Design a binder for this molecule. Structure first.
Ligand code: AIT
Ligand code: AIT
Lengths: 245, 245
């Protein structure tokens, strides 16, 4: 993503966006009978498949080794789901738009032990986004930064290959920084407002990390899923042949 | 911190730095006999007292209500210890400088179940700092951002007071952003390198959040301490009289 213009990065990222999926419950049937966590887990599993396709279209990602791609997604997948949730919840004060047919308030989260704490964090993030007037162009930049950043400090090694990979990633993160500043300049913010808004945006990423960690903690205490480790499922998805070319 | 110059912010922050404390073990006695976690916990408890004094000298902090001060420190204290640890470990490749008389490598962390995972994260952060050539002026800015940012999205309320507080905090974070850019400009980086370096710095804060969350998880499974909730201990420390004026 190192010779692509800022305008080329932005349209690539807008072109790569995944679809908005629906919850799978029968809407002709009552609600007292649906497992909220089963509904949420099924939604999340379905989104993950589309996340892999998206990641492959983030400039620079597929130039990485397959191992490193798996590591980055293993590190970032919940941050990536959550920022997407807060983004589509932005125009819906007090509610989380998990899917177009599944819009939940905080009292619906009390439905699950320990879940209202996570709901409240997501809702607050959504409110911050709304107050900053975050733009779709800025959002796709931030989601790609999460992908490239969250796992880059935990690669074990420091083989020559590994050092080359880290370098490449930092290079791509740097172009996305240039892209966010370009977007802001185009919008006519001053120099000073650009850097202030860039910092405001990147500091929310620390909150998103916090919510992912808390949600991983919460998830690891119910039924959700942990059959076949995540790494292997990600590897299968990412390690594609080219036969269906 | 909203009429203070960038140069005034930087010297206030340099003036506020806490002291480097020593580990309390008898150095005339063997090491096989010291509880590494007891040594680390005692060090951390001692640093906390000095952290409160530091926080009160961060521009804008004491203009907050006492409740909000307690909340911010309750949210950020482990991130603040850890960034300080990685900073003083920077010139010591492969080791963590917990104190001048307590310099540990990763094999010394294996000493505690589940601790080498945290050590490895801290060491990697330290290596990133060293590779970025982080400067003492940039460090104190980042530590103050952690203080003001980590808890600002989780205040419950939205009383008028609460909305005023959040506004003030964002205002102070904005001046620290201006300060980091000033520092970088003074150093003669280009416009482009400034924004890139600002983003590189703020993205490491997401890793520091990650390490704090993982370390809180790890800490909550041993002896460390949880007698009298943290809030109340922080409140006592922060709720000072002015008699010793
Ligand atoms: C089994 C596990 C399910 O993961 C989940 C399950 C549910 C959700 C929960 O539901 C969604 C659904 C879609 C989405 O875009 C975001 C969320 S967030 C929420 C949640 C997250 C953490 C919590 O502690 C509580 C609620 C998010 C992720 N698989 C997901 C794909 C890889 C593993
Ligand atoms: C009892 C609790 C002790 O907290 C601790 C105890 C030990 C340390 C450990 O030792 C220090 C000591 C000083 C310092 O500046 C950083 C660290 S980090 C490390 C550690 C952190 C998390 C882990 O899972 C493993 C190692 C850091 C914090 N009190 C600290 C003051 C408030 C509560």
């Amino acid at each position: 993503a190192l010779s692509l213009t800022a305008d080329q990065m932005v349209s690539a990222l807008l072109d790569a966006e995944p679809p908005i999926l629906y919850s799978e419950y029968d809407p002709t049937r009552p609600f007292s009978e649906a497992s909220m966590m089963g509904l949420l887990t099924n939604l999340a599993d379905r989104e993950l498949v589309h996340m892999i396709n998206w990641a492959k279209r983030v400039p620079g990602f597929v130039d990485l080794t397959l191992h490193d791609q798996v590591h980055l997604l293993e590190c970032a997948w919940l941050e990536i789901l959550m920022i997407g949730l807060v983004w589509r919840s932005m125009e819906h004060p007090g509610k989380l738009l998990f899917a177009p047919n599944l819009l939940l308030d905080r009292n619906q989260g009390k439905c699950v032990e320990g879940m209202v704490e996570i709901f409240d964090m997501l809702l607050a993030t959504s409110s911050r986004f709304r107050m900053m007037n975050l733009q779709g162009e800025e959002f796709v930049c931030l989601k790609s930064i999460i992908l490239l950043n969250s796992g880059v400090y935990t690669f074990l090694s420091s083989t020559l290959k590994s050092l080359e990979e880290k370098d490449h990633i930092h290079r791509v993160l740097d172009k996305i920084t240039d892209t966010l500043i370009h977007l802001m300049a185009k919008a006519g913010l001053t120099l000073q407002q650009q850097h202030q808004r860039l910092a405001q945006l990147l500091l929310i990423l620390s909150h998103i990390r916090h919510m992912s960690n808390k949600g991983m903690e919460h998830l690891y205490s119910m039924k959700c899923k942990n059959v076949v480790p995540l790494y292997d499922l990600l590897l299968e998805m990412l390690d594609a042949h080219r036969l269906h070319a």
